Ligand binder design. Structure first.
Ligand SMILES: OC[C@H]1O[C@@H](O[C@H]2[C@@H](OC[C@H]3O[C@@H](O)[C@H](O)[C@@H](O)[C@@H]3O[C@@H]3O[C@H](CO)[C@@H](O)[C@H](O)[C@H]3O)OC[C@@H](O)[C@@H]2O)[C@H](O)[C@@H](O)[C@H]1O
Ligand SMILES: [Mg+2]
Length: 340
């Protein structure tokens, strides 16, 4: 019986990621990492604006690596932990559902070499023991997502679910994460914990190898920017959405159904979105097809928002954080009103 997790998630309309913020990796061991990729310092007002538009759930990606002390304690710098807590608390103040992750650890220590399992598990657990202790008294609306796209960057199968040995390592790491958090007790005894596949990949072989914990208070996170050629800019990419590629969404979702949803395992899409390609009407249609597909089984998603829209880079921006106005209200309306 995993129905507690389903009940919690059912309270979410749609979610929103505070992207390129606490996950940013500049600035070294400093709170200034937050602004190192060009975003303004997060404020209560920024978070309020997200909530008010209809995104009542927020994912707060955080990269800890450069804020950690030496092994084996990996102590999180006090100033950084305090800042992370301030940002989470903006959301708590507004009664929001929240996901706290670890993020670009994958640029640093989180490289999925199966021969390094012990060091990997131990580092993950050490960070999560500290996070869990810090957030022990926070209510069930705060959820933890152990890893983000864990993988071996630059490997042949980096973006296709890795190798079988890597997927075994992911299973061990998911367990380490759950164990570390549960061992801290308090509200962490039954907090929703959100594990993942290798790379947050949803291909059939990747899902077939995912071990499902016996802990009843878990969910499985995937990232599904599907189809890639619509949502990203690449050789072969396009900006038109007429429905003809809805099958890409359907086929992938039927695997998520086969291995997770139809087995009663909670699933959360912790990142998706489409880069802005002067194609508002197409993105609106894609959201209909994509979010509409998730809604069939009440699966929730969180939209990636990096505050990039007018300038160069990956144009996932939705909230103009400096102005507290939305870059594209038609796109935003399609997300927040998905269930009407
Ligand atoms: O530039 C070459 C460089 O890529 C490095 O990774 C980046 C790269 O995209 C990988 C994508 O490749 C397509 O051919 C894949 O089909 C697609 O599924 C995958 O894109 C990644 O997709 C993820 C979601 O499933 C998403 O969160 C992620 O952002 C997306 O990358 O270009 C996009 C960047 O985001 C990647 O970091 C790779 O490490 C490097 O060695 C080299 O191949
Ligand atoms: Mg309790």
């Amino acid at each position: 019986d995993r129905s507690r997790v389903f009940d919690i998630l059912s309270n979410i309309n749609i979610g929103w990621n505070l992207g390129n913020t606490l996950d940013a990796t500049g600035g070294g061991n400093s709170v200034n990492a937050e602004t190192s990729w060009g975003n303004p310092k997060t404020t209560q007002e920024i978070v309020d604006t997200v909530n008010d538009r209809g995104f009542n759930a927020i994912r707060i990606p955080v990269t800890f690596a450069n804020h950690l002390g030496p092994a084996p304690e990996y102590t999180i710098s006090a100033d950084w932990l305090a800042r992370v807590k301030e940002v989470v608390d903006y959301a708590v103040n507004d009664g929001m559902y929240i996901i706290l992750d670890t993020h670009h650890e994958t640029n640093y220590w989180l490289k999925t070499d199966p021969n390094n399992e012990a060091a990997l598990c131990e580092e993950l657990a050490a960070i999560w023991k500290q996070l869990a202790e810090a957030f022990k008294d926070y209510d069930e609306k705060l959820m933890f997502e152990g890893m983000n796209e864990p993988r071996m960057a630059g490997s042949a199968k980096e973006w296709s679910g890795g190798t079988p040995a890597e997927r075994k390592l992911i299973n061990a790491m998911n367990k380490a994460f759950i164990d570390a958090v549960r061992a801290t007790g308090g509200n962490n005894a039954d907090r929703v914990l959100i594990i993942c596949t290798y790379g947050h990949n949803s291909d059939e072989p990747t899902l077939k190898d995912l071990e499902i914990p016996s802990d009843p208070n878990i969910a499985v996170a995937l990232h599904t920017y599907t189809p890639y050629f619509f949502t990203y800019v690449a050789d072969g990419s396009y900006s038109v959405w007429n429905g003809s590629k809805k099958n890409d969404i359907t086929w992938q979702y039927n695997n998520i159904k086969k291995y997770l949803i139809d087995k009663g395992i909670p699933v959360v899409i912790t990142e998706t979105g489409a880069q802005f390609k002067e194609n508002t009407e197409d993105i609106v249609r894609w959201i209909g097809d994509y979010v509409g597909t998730l809604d069939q089984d009440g699966v929730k998603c969180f939209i990636w928002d990096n505050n990039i829209y007018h300038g160069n880079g990956e144009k996932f921006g939705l909230l103009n954080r400096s102005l507290l106005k939305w870059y594209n209200d038609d796109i935003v309306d399609a997300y927040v009103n998905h269930a009407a």
